Design an enzyme around this catalytic site. Structure first.
Site, PDB file in Angstrom:
ATOM      1  N   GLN D   2       0.825  -1.197   0.000  1.00  0.00           N
ATOM      2  CA  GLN D   2       0.000   0.000   0.000  1.00  0.00           C
ATOM      3  C   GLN D   2       0.866   1.256   0.000  1.00  0.00           C
ATOM      4  O   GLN D   2       2.038   1.241   0.386  1.00  0.00           O
ATOM      5  CB  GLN D   2      -0.926   0.010   1.214  1.00  0.00           C
ATOM      6  CG  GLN D   2      -1.849  -1.191   1.300  1.00  0.00           C
ATOM      7  CD  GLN D   2      -2.739  -1.148   2.523  1.00  0.00           C
ATOM      8  OE1 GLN D   2      -3.518  -0.213   2.704  1.00  0.00           O
ATOM      9  NE2 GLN D   2      -2.625  -2.159   3.375  1.00  0.00           N
ATOM     10  N   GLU D   3       0.264   2.358  -0.443  1.00  0.00           N
ATOM     11  CA  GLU D   3       0.912   3.668  -0.444  1.00  0.00           C
ATOM     12  C   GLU D   3       2.262   3.616  -1.156  1.00  0.00           C
ATOM     13  O   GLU D   3       3.298   3.999  -0.613  1.00  0.00           O
ATOM     14  CB  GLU D   3       1.065   4.198   0.982  1.00  0.00           C
ATOM     15  CG  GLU D   3      -0.249   4.568   1.649  1.00  0.00           C
ATOM     16  CD  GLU D   3      -0.572   6.044   1.519  1.00  0.00           C
ATOM     17  OE1 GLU D   3      -0.354   6.607   0.425  1.00  0.00           O
ATOM     18  OE2 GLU D   3      -1.045   6.641   2.509  1.00  0.00           O
ATOM     19  N   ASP D   4       2.238   3.126  -2.395  1.00  0.00           N
ATOM     20  CA  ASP D   4       3.410   3.116  -3.267  1.00  0.00           C
ATOM     21  C   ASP D   4       4.513   2.199  -2.748  1.00  0.00           C
ATOM     22  O   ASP D   4       5.698   2.475  -2.944  1.00  0.00           O
ATOM     23  CB  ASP D   4       3.958   4.532  -3.470  1.00  0.00           C
ATOM     24  CG  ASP D   4       2.941   5.465  -4.096  1.00  0.00           C
ATOM     25  OD1 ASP D   4       2.484   5.178  -5.223  1.00  0.00           O
ATOM     26  OD2 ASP D   4       2.597   6.484  -3.462  1.00  0.00           O
ATOM     27  N   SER D   5       4.143   1.113  -2.078  1.00  0.00           N
ATOM     28  CA  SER D   5       5.082   0.077  -1.688  1.00  0.00           C
ATOM     29  C   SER D   5       4.972  -1.088  -2.669  1.00  0.00           C
ATOM     30  O   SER D   5       4.147  -1.084  -3.586  1.00  0.00           O
ATOM     31  CB  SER D   5       4.817  -0.367  -0.248  1.00  0.00           C
ATOM     32  OG  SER D   5       5.672  -1.432   0.127  1.00  0.00           O
TER      33      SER D   5
END
Ligand SMILES: [Zn+2]
Ligand SMILES: [Zn+2]
Ligand SMILES: [Zn+2]
Ligand SMILES: [Zn+2]
Ligand SMILES: [Zn+2]
Lengths: 45, 98, 308, 147, 56, 56, 69, 111, 42
Positions: D2-5
């Site tokens: 999530q969140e650009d991981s």
């Protein structure tokens, strides 16, 4: 004395502290220290 | 078990960037202090500390953690004891503590 | 002859003197190596300016220059006022001498170490009774020669004279005086080594061979010839310049490089008659003036050397 | 992720996905301070060198340089150099007549390690001896690397 | 006893006199005996409150 | 303020000299000595003052 | 630089097929896809492993050796 | 380790009274008079007495004590010197204020 | 009169070397920068 290798003609030289840093054969002013002769362990991972 | 939804799957060109966590991670409990200000030195390569800036001070003031603010500014950084005269506030008191 | 004002770190608990002390720079601590007790904490590791206390000593000064907003009148008047200082006048002479030394060395294309050593020698030998009647040109030239010798890049008297206009008598007298001063200060207050010797003809050969454009093999052969040339008494008394030039010419004709003595002597400023005369003396001992390894490998034999 | 991981395959990492070599170079020179003071490449000893670093000098040779192919870790000295000191200067005691040199060595970065790849010795424009030492390391993808 | 190289562990021990002892270089004399009022600087363990921030 | 600030004190007759802590001498390799800009300016002030004294 | 020994995705051995792939491309005048299929590479994970490889070791071998023996 | 124990009462700063040094106060506060524009003696071994880095003004080294309080670098707060100017000079930060006061008061009787 | 002293080559040499080593285009800033060798496209 320690063993070095010319960076251009790849000749092994034996240099002491007093000797100037220069190849006695071709005259190049860059020498690479000879690789150590003691084994080095590497993991295959 | 089969996933209820189907996954978009295929090759794609990916690049490894220069930023690595092992080249940024750094922590300090204590370390060298600069000669001038006698505060923690700057730079992670020299085991330096992190900056508790004006914005952090304002946020802690908003939180109301006065004791934490004082500890951050004194115990976690430069803390110096000086002797002051009661007649003149000047800190020009020679103290032979021994 | 003064207060001690010295701090010695010792462990009160261990009492061992001298103590084993470890400086944990990362943790900013000084710790006893035996018991682990911390002796001193919060140890310390542009706002300032650097100076070398060997060429300028202790002399702090600041310049005056234009800023983002400035009037030329104030700058001119302030520089004028600063110029008329009596205390700073004495060291301004040394600074001007340093400037001229720097100009000469830079025009000579010499390394930084050479000019630094020349400035150091000038400062050490200046302000003395012995050197009071000699020209500043002679003083500077002698200092430059001393620095060049100290840097293992020794030049020659004629080479230095090509830049500094000083006659040989004055130059030699000043050089001797400066050497005596350096020796005296080395004793009372090192300075010299095998390089301080005068002849040192081996150092000149590479540069002369470079001027003539000969290969490094010929340069090495000439170095060997010059090194072995000192064994002949009929030549050891000659000038080192002549010894090196004659060895170089001998090797040139050994390798049959199309360079005549008329051009060798013209390039190295040596008489052709002198070159050929020295060749005559060395021809009688050519056998001891050629490298055994070279003659064995067969790059050339003794044959390729015409003798009169 | 999530969140650009992102989630990466550990098996692929083991097989060589997005693995890299890192080469780091260190340079050091022999400075000559006047006609009196001069620095030299040396393997300083505990009896003649003052203020020498707490690291290990066992890997240095007689010339003060580590031969290529030798492994180095944090705090290890790779270029050993010494300079003379003036008398009448005592620091934290420990300064006796035996001490006549002080260390000016170049230590390896604290967090870095690897194997010395190539060390070259030559002379600069001024004729002073200076050396360049290169160290190799392997960077494997981690839970913090950026792609 | 664990020392500074094993988490959970300790790095420094401060006596009531204010002096600080580095557990490294101190094992030569064995484990230190703790007394009331002393301070042990131990590694931050689980559930320890810490301030977490992000600039600006 | 009669006690803390008089107009006559806006003109400097005795210049205080800060202690070295205010103007520390840094070192790069510890073989070369550097002095603070305040030290340089104070040296300039002293030289100018001595010159003016000798002149007048 | 050199052909990977194993496919990253699945681990199939692909380092023993580089020379065969090049030989099929050159001597047999076969297309890349046909050569990959003939070599036994069915999954596109291995197909890309052999298709997108760049041989930089050949260029590195053009430099003279640093040390002789 | 920490700083050495002191017998003086520990208090908290409650007020700050700003002001300007008088020449008499500067001279009284000063521990030494600086009259040499140098930093080290001719030997470059110890600081010159009366110079800029006079040992009586404090120490910035971990190996030397202060000649005034005999304390280390981590305890000495620093001691002020003074230079007696040959002639009075203006304060660069007070030139405008001085000009206003001059225009406000008579330049012959100060009324 | 000595030409070797009349003409000082260090003027040209040092001026060019300074102007190229540093970005100060004198005796504007950032005119010269260290070439990026992180990758070929860079
Ligand atoms: Zn060679
Ligand atoms: Zn008071
Ligand atoms: Zn102890
Ligand atoms: Zn596959
Ligand atoms: Zn003090």
């Amino acid at each position: 004395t320690l063993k070095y290798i010319c960076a251009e003609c790849s000749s092994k030289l034996s240099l002491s502290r007093t000797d100037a840093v220069r190849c006695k054969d071709c005259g190049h002013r860059i020498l690479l220290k000879a690789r150590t002769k003691r084994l080095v362990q590497f993991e295959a991972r | 078990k089969k996933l209820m939804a189907q996954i978009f799957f295929g090759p794609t060109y990916y690049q490894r960037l220069r930023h690595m966590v092992d080249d940024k991670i750094h922590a300090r409990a204590r370390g060298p202090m600069q000669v001038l200000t006698r505060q923690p030195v700057e730079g992670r390569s020299r085991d330096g500390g992190l900056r508790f800036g004006e914005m952090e001070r304002d946020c802690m003031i908003a939180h109301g953690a006065a004791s934490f603010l004082k500890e951050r500014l004194m115990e976690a950084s430069d803390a110096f004891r000086v002797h002051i005269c009661g007649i003149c506030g000047l800190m020009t008191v020679i103290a032979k503590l021994n | 002859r003064g207060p001690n004002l010295n701090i010695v770190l010792t462990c009160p608990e261990c009492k061992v003197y001298p103590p084993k002390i470890v400086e944990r720079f990362s943790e900013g601590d000084v710790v006893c190596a035996l018991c682990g007790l911390v002796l001193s904490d919060k140890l310390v590791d542009r706002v300032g300016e650097a100076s070398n206390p060997l060429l300028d000593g202790n002399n702090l000064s600041t310049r005056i220059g234009k800023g983002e907003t400035t009037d030329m009148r104030f700058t001119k008047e302030l520089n004028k006022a600063q110029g008329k200082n009596v205390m700073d006048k004495k060291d301004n002479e040394v600074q001007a001498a340093f400037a001229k030394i720097t100009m000469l060395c830079d025009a000579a294309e010499l390394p930084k170490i050479v000019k630094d050593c020349a400035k150091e020698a000038y400062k050490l030998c200046h302000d003395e009774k012995t050197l009071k009647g000699k020209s500043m040109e002679s003083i500077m030239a002698a200092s430059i020669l001393i620095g060049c010798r100290r840097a293992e890049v020794a030049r020659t008297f004629k080479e230095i004279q090509s830049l500094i206009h000083v006659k040989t008598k004055e130059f030699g007298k000043t050089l001797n005086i400066m050497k005596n001063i350096l020796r005296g200060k080395s004793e009372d207050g090192k300075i010299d080594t095998d390089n301080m010797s005068g002849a040192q003809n081996l150092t000149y050969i590479p540069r002369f061979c470079s001027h003539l454009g000969l290969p490094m093999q010929v340069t090495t052969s000439a170095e060997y010839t010059a090194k072995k040339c000192k064994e002949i008494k009929e030549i050891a008394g000659k000038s080192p310049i002549t010894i090196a030039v004659v060895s170089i010419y001998l090797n040139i004709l050994l390798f049959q490089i199309p360079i005549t003595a008329a051009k060798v002597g013209q390039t190295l400023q040596v008489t052709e008659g002198t070159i050929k005369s020295g060749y005559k003396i060395l021809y009688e001992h050519r056998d001891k003036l050629v490298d055994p390894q070279l003659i064995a490998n067969g790059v050339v034999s003794l044959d390729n050397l015409p003798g009169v | 992720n999530q969140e650009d991981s992102m989630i990466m395959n550990q098996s692929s990492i083991d097989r060589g996905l997005f693995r890299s070599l890192f080469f780091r170079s260190y340079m050091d020179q022999e400075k000559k301070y006047g006609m009196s003071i001069t620095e030299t490449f040396e393997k300083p000893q505990r009896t003649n060198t003052l203020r020498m670093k707490h690291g290990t000098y066992d890997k240095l040779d007689d010339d003060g340089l580590i031969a290529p192919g030798v492994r180095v870790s944090g705090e290890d000295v790779i270029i050993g150099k010494t300079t003379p000191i003036s008398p009448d200067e005592e620091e934290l005691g420990q300064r006796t007549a035996y001490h006549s040199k002080r260390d000016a060595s170049t230590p390896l970065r604290s967090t870095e390690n690897g194997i010395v790849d190539q060390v070259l010795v030559t002379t600069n424009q001024d004729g002073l001896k200076f050396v360049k030492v290169r160290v190799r390391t392997t960077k494997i993808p981690q839970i913090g690397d950026k792609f | 006893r664990n020392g500074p190289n094993e988490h959970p562990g300790a790095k420094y021990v401060i006596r009531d006199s204010g002096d600080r002892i580095d557990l490294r270089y101190s094992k030569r004399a064995g484990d230190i005996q703790l007394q009331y009022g002393w301070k042990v600087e131990r590694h931050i363990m689980d559930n320890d409150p810490v301030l977490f921030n992000r600039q600006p | 303020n009669e006690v803390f600030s008089r107009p006559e004190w806006m003109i400097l007759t005795c210049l205080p000299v800060p202690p070295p802590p205010v103007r520390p001498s840094i070192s790069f390799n510890e073989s070369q000595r550097g002095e603070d800009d305040l030290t340089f300016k104070l040296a300039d002030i002293l030289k100018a003052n001595i010159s003016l004294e000798t002149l007048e | 630089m050199i052909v990977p020994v194993r496919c990253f995705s699945c681990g199939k051995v692909v380092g023993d097929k580089w020379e065969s792939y090049l030989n099929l491309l050159q001597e047999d005048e076969l297309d890349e896809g046909t050569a990959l299929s003939r070599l036994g590479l069915k999954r596109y994970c291995c197909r890309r492993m052999i298709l997108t490889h760049v041989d930089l070791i050949e260029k590195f071998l053009r430099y003279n050796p640093l040390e002789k023996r | 380790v920490g700083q050495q124990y002191s017998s003086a009462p520990l208090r908290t700063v409650k007020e700050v009274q700003f002001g300007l040094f008088s020449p008499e106060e500067v001279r009284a506060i000063s521990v030494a008079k600086i009259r040499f524009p140098e930093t080290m003696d001719e030997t470059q071994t110890r600081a010159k007495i009366g110079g800029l880095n006079d040992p009586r003004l404090g120490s910035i080294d971990r190996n030397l004590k202060c000649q005034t309080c005999q304390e280390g670098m981590n305890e000495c707060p620093g001691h002020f010197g003074h230079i007696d100017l040959a002639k009075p000079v203006f304060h660069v930060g007070f030139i405008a204020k001085i000009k206003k006061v001059c225009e406000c008061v008579c330049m012959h009787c100060g009324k | 009169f000595n030409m070797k002293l009349a003409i000082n080559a260090k003027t040209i040499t040092s001026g060019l070397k300074y102007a190229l080593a540093t970005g100060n285009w004198g005796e504007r800033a950032g005119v010269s920068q260290v070439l990026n060798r992180y990758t070929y496209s860079s």
